[PDB]
């Protein structure tokens, strides 16, 4: 019944941002063996909450949303941003309360010749609402011609491959992103009743 924070940050594979993953962390105790430091993350920003709320889940569920984007797109994982990622892929509310963690993953998510396994949505009829997830693959109609059969040059498959190559500049390297949001509970979790003594006897 340890909180699987280690699984979130050390996961072998991450989701594409258009199909971003959500993991629920609940009714568990903090894992006193898991540690990250300044060198681990390139960003660790909280909005309207102190990250110490992650330590006690007695009245809290934590939701960890994770995915891979470009270094120069991490700035879009913030309240009130625009751009392809915030508009069409993963949108934080204007009143967002939670934390955003990101780190350079060039050493895991790039490879010689390019890694193309990660995708993002390039076209959409309207902007996502906060925390909306759109994994559809309907053909996108960019012109006046409808899209039927193979008709229509201006008809577009809406998902786009990143191409992460290891020698790209840092702004075009892949970054893993974890968004942490907090659910206030009304009844105490069963876990409620994992102590600093575990490290000191």
């Amino acid at each position, epitope marked *: 019944n340890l909180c699987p924070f280690g699984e979130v940050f050390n996961a072998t594979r991450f989701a594409s941002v258009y199909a971003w993953n959500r993991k629920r962390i609940s009714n568990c105790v903090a894992d006193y063996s898991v540690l990250y430091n300044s060198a681990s993350f390139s960003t660790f920003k909280c909005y309207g909450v102190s990250p110490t709320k992650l330590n006690d889940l007695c009245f809290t569920n934590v939701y960890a949303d994770s995915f891979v984007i470009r270094g120069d797109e991490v700035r879009q994982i913030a309240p009130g941003q625009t751009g392809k990622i915030a508009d069409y892929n993963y949108k934080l509310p204007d009143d967002f309360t939670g934390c955003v963690i990101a780190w350079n993953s060039n050493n895991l998510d790039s490879k010689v010749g*390019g890694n193309y396994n990660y995708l993002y949505r390039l076209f959409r009829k309207s902007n996502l609402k906060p925390f909306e997830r759109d994994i559809s*693959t309907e053909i996108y109609q960019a012109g006046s011609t409808p899209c039927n059969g*193979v008709e229509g*040059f201006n*008809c577009y498959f809406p998902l*786009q491959s990143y*191409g992460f190559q290891p020698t790209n500049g840092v702004g075009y390297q892949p970054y893993r992103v974890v968004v942490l949001s907090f659910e206030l509970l009304h009844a105490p979790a069963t876990v409620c009743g994992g102590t600093l003594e575990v490290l000191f006897q």
Partner: nanobody, 117 residues
């Protein structure tokens, strides 16, 4: 590093056929949508046909529907434009294009001449 090389053009009588080749280097042809354009004398560039990444499909301008076929050989890293039943209105310079959306970060986006008698 990253290169698109068009070939296959020529001068052919109306009703004949050609096959254009777009040989790509520096990226896999199948990961992004690949496209054929043409610019005819006295006109602006026109999208002719496109082949989406992987098996997500092909697209054709109405003017070439039933006459042109776009295809892709992954092993040769080449996109093809098979042109049958050529008409004088198909006379143009034809160009290849990759829709990388800036994912070929250091590649800033020659053509092959088709003349139908």
């Amino acid at each position: 590093q990253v290169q698109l090389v068009e070939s296959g053009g020529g001068l052919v009588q109306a009703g004949g056929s050609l096959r254009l080749s777009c040989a790509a280097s520096g990226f896999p042809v199948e990961v992004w949508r690949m496209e054929w354009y043409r610019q005819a004398p006295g006109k602006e560039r026109e999208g002719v046909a496109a082949i989406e990444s992987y098996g997500h499909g092909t697209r054709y301008a109405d003017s070439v529907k039933g006459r042109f076929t776009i295809s892709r050989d992954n092993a040769k890293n080449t996109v093809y434009l098979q042109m049958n039943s050529l008409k004088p209105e198909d006379t143009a310079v034809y160009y290849c294009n990759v829709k990388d959306d800036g994912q070929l970060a250091y590649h800033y986006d020659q053509g092959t001449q088709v003349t139908v008698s």
